[PDB]
């Protein structure tokens, strides 16, 4: 359907945003673990 191609930039951008948030959260969690070790 043409709806899929029309919204594909939005779907890909949303997936990229989700991956960015998840990676940032994991990074922050590891830094928090290092803080607790200290």
């Amino acid at each position: 359907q043409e709806l899929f191609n029309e919204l594909k930039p939005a779907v890909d951008g949303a997936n990229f945003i989700v991956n960015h948030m998840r990676d940032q959260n994991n990074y922050n969690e590891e830094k928090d673990s290092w803080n607790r070790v200290a």
Partner: peptide, 24 residues
Amino acid sequence: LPELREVVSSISYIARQLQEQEDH
């Protein structure tokens, strides 16, 4: 549907900005 086009534009802009943030 210009509203959906504007939504797509905003999402694309946000993803692009996060890409530049990653490169930096």
